[PDB]
């Protein structure tokens, strides 16, 4: 079949989870992966990538983005790009240079399935070209235009059918009109692209919007997208990469035989950018030394918990005196970045001392009391991601709010914007709030009743006594508690998490929705007066909740009503 459409593989849709595949598949380089012989070195590959906290779909994306590939005589091969990514170096670049050498047609695809009179396109610079033009797109829009591009000579042809397709839009007035005439010209568009039969042109329309999710996910993993809403963005601070990426992109035709294209299209360093040499490398880490001592000059008077970040890249930049080459710079420049998402977390501190930027927490926050139907319309007007990696997000600025910890560790994905991507790992909590003296958990979930039982008690408790072990080993000295927040805590949610406290001496707060918009309010009216919380003050609210869970006499509703009582005491303190 003649393909009309390009994808992003859904299997992860997020690309942080493809370094421990790729790890495990490493260690069978060398084994035979074709044919009948290939069959034993694929199950075993199943067997170890298991234990990880179909095999030919796993494969397929790292063989589409240059990490493996299969010889001619049949055996793994492991691409140096691949080598990168499993040892976990630098991995947001490597993953930027391959998906900009990522072509149709490829080894992985080509023939008579994609002929070179239909395709010739590298999908992400692609999208950076057309972006210059339509300035944003939603998911919706990457679904709809996106996909079914398949030559890089139609940037200005879709440019130009968008902007038509959103001016129309706009004249239609009211917002249910224009949810038929969008998904009617989605539909008609399908219609000619892919041309009962509703299903058939549906799924395409399904299948288009899943691709389009994973494909802003990918996008943004590599830092030359954001996320400004609802919509992908070019990322403003990388502007003269893109122009450089858009400028030196290529299809090139040696793709036909896997040794000749692997040669260039494993090969992490290609495409080598002007400003990669050792001379130029130094004034980019110079110029991200300065945009880091700016951000941490502006917040060190009100924020001295930048100091955490301001040792930190002391320590990183003290590497160029021992060695001044181009590795060790690339690893000067990478973790500097790295650093800089830091420093604008803390940023955010002084950001949220304008009452409105406040407030806008708190009121996004309160969107999840209404109704799920009214959730889901509201944050995917707002955001990309969805609105359970959202609430996570919102919880982690409702953390940033509080303020005074030296590290504000979401475990879900953010993108260089501070935009939320992706939920957090299965074994992860879904935020570690490093204060001094102790450390605060997130766990957060918007579900309710028996699913929320079944979905949260085992891996919140999970968390906490890995996390705590894990402390014990390092030897950090510090307390640690778990906040679980929910709009709704569910009663056998809250009596199992109480019994940990009790038996198992973990140290789980459930807090509902209302109770931890409680703590932002307070924050905002200290502001106004001039005043804000302490560690203190935070330390002393988890040690009188924690206190109350174990002392409390063991009833559902007298532990209830006494954490609303010691929640209310502290609350009464801030007068």
């Given at each position: 079949a003649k393909k009309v459409n390009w994808y992003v593989s859904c299997s992860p849709r997020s690309p942080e989870k493809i370094q421990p595949e790729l790890k495990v598949l490493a260690n069978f380089e060398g084994s035979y992966w074709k044919g009948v012989k290939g069959y034993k070195a694929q199950e075993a590959f199943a067997k170890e990538l298991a234990a990880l906290p179909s095999t030919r779909d796993?494969?397929?994306?790292?063989?589409?983005?240059?990490?493996?590939?299969?010889?001619?005589?049949?055996y793994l091969r492991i691409t140096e790009a691949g080598k990168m990514l499993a040892n976990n170096r630098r991995p947001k670049d490597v993953f930027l240079k391959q998906l900009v050498k990522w072509q149709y047609p490829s080894f992985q695809h080509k023939g008579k399935e994609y002929p070179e009179e239909?395709?010739?396109?590298?999908?992400?610079?692609?999208?950076?070209?057309?972006?210059?033009?339509?300035?944003?797109?939603?998911?919706?829009?990457?679904?709809?235009?996106?996909?079914?591009?398949?030559?890089?000579?139609?940037?200005?042809?879709?440019a130009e059918e968008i902007m038509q397709f959103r001016n129309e839009r706009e004249k239609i007035k009211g917002q249910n009109k224009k949810l038929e005439f969008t998904?009617?010209?989605?539909?008609?568009?399908?219609?000619?692209?892919?041309?009962?039969?509703?299903?058939?042109i549906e799924t395409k329309m399904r299948n288009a919007r899943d691709v389009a999710d994973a494909t802003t996910r990918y996008f943004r993993y590599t830092g030359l997208f954001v996320a400004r809403g609802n919509q992908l963005v070019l990322n403003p601070e990388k502007s003269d990469l893109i122009d450089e990426i858009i400028s030196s992109s290529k299809v090139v035709k040696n793709y036909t035989r896997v040794e000749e294209f692997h040669e260039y299209y494993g090969n992490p360093s290609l495409p080598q950018f002007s400003f990669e040499t050792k001379e130029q490398l130094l004034d980019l880490a110079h110029r991200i030394r300065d945009e880091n001592t700016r951000l941490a000059e502006?917040?060190?008077?009100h924020f001295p918990n930048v100091k955490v970040e301001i040792q930190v890249l002391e320590d990183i930049y003290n590497s160029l005196n021992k060695k001044?080459?181009?590795?060790?710079?690339?690893?000067?420049?990478?973790?500097?970045?790295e650093l800089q998402l830091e420093l604008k977390k803390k940023k955010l501190q002084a950001d949220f001392n304008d009452?409105?930027?406040?407030?806008?927490?708190?009121?996004?926050?309160?969107?999840?009391?209404?109704k799920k139907n009214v959730i889901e319309e509201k944050i995917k007007a707002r955001f990309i991601a969805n609105k359970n990696t959202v609430f996570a997000w919102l919880t982690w600025n409702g953390f940033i709010i509080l303020g005074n910890a030296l590290e504000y560790k979401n475990n879900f994905v953010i993108d260089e914007e501070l935009q939320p991507v992706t939920h957090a790992a299965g074994n992860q909590p879904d935020m570690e709030i490093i204060y001094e003296d102790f450390i605060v958990l997130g766990e957060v979930t918007?579900?309710?009743?028996?699913?929320?039982?079944?979905?949260?008690?085992?891996?919140?408790?999970?968390?906490?006594?890995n996390k705590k072990k894990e402390l014990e080993k390092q030897g950090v000295e510090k307390e640690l508690y778990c906040l679980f927040i929910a709009p709704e805590i569910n009663k056998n949610t809250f009596e199992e998490f109480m019994k940990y406290n009790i038996v198992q001496n973990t140290r789980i707060i459930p807090l509902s929705l209302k109770q931890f918009n409680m703590l932002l309010m307070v924050q905002?009216?200290?502001?106004?007066?001039?005043?804000?919380?302490?560690?203190?003050?935070?330390?002393?609210?988890?040690?009188?909740l924690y206190r109350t869970t174990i002392e409390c006499e063991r009833k559902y509703t007298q532990i209830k009503a006494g954490l609303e009582e010691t929640l209310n005491n502290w609350v009464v303190d801030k007068e």
């Amino acid at each position: 079949a003649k393909k009309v459409n390009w994808y992003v593989s859904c299997s992860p849709r997020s690309p942080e989870k493809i370094q421990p595949e790729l790890k495990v598949l490493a260690n069978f380089e060398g084994s035979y992966w074709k044919g009948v012989k290939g069959y034993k070195a694929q199950e075993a590959f199943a067997k170890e990538l298991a234990a990880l906290p179909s095999t030919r779909d796993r494969v397929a994306p790292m063989k589409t983005y240059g990490f493996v590939f299969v010889d001619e005589e049949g055996y793994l091969r492991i691409t140096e790009a691949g080598k990168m990514l499993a040892n976990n170096r630098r991995p947001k670049d490597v993953f930027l240079k391959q998906l900009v050498k990522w072509q149709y047609p490829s080894f992985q695809h080509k023939g008579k399935e994609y002929p070179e009179e239909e395709w010739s396109i590298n999908p992400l610079v692609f999208v950076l070209s057309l972006l210059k033009k339509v300035g944003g797109l939603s998911k919706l829009d990457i679904a709809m235009f996106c996909l079914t591009a398949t030559n890089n000579n139609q940037v200005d042809e879709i440019a130009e059918e968008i902007m038509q397709f959103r001016n129309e839009r706009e004249k239609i007035k009211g917002q249910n009109k224009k949810l038929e005439f969008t998904e009617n010209y989605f539909f008609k568009r399908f219609e000619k692209i892919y041309g009962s039969h509703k299903s058939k042109i549906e799924t395409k329309m399904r299948n288009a919007r899943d691709v389009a999710d994973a494909t802003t996910r990918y996008f943004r993993y590599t830092g030359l997208f954001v996320a400004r809403g609802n919509q992908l963005v070019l990322n403003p601070e990388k502007s003269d990469l893109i122009d450089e990426i858009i400028s030196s992109s290529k299809v090139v035709k040696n793709y036909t035989r896997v040794e000749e294209f692997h040669e260039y299209y494993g090969n992490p360093s290609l495409p080598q950018f002007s400003f990669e040499t050792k001379e130029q490398l130094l004034d980019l880490a110079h110029r991200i030394r300065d945009e880091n001592t700016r951000l941490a000059e502006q917040l060190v008077e009100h924020f001295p918990n930048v100091k955490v970040e301001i040792q930190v890249l002391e320590d990183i930049y003290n590497s160029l005196n021992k060695k001044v080459d181009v590795e060790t710079l690339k690893d000067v420049i990478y973790h500097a970045k790295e650093l800089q998402l830091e420093l604008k977390k803390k940023k955010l501190q002084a950001d949220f001392n304008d009452p409105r930027q406040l407030e806008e927490v708190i009121d996004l926050l309160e969107v999840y009391h209404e109704k799920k139907n009214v959730i889901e319309e509201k944050i995917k007007a707002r955001f990309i991601a969805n609105k359970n990696t959202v609430f996570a997000w919102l919880t982690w600025n409702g953390f940033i709010i509080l303020g005074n910890a030296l590290e504000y560790k979401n475990n879900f994905v953010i993108d260089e914007e501070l935009q939320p991507v992706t939920h957090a790992a299965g074994n992860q909590p879904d935020m570690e709030i490093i204060y001094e003296d102790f450390i605060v958990l997130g766990e957060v979930t918007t579900s309710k009743g028996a699913t929320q039982f079944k979905m949260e008690s085992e891996p919140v408790t999970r968390h906490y006594l890995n996390k705590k072990k894990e402390l014990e080993k390092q030897g950090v000295e510090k307390e640690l508690y778990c906040l679980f927040i929910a709009p709704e805590i569910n009663k056998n949610t809250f009596e199992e998490f109480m019994k940990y406290n009790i038996v198992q001496n973990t140290r789980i707060i459930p807090l509902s929705l209302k109770q931890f918009n409680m703590l932002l309010m307070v924050q905002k009216k200290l502001i106004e007066k001039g005043r804000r919380l302490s560690s203190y003050d935070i330390k002393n609210l988890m040690v009188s909740l924690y206190r109350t869970t174990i002392e409390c006499e063991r009833k559902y509703t007298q532990i209830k009503a006494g954490l609303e009582e010691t929640l209310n005491n502290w609350v009464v303190d801030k007068e």
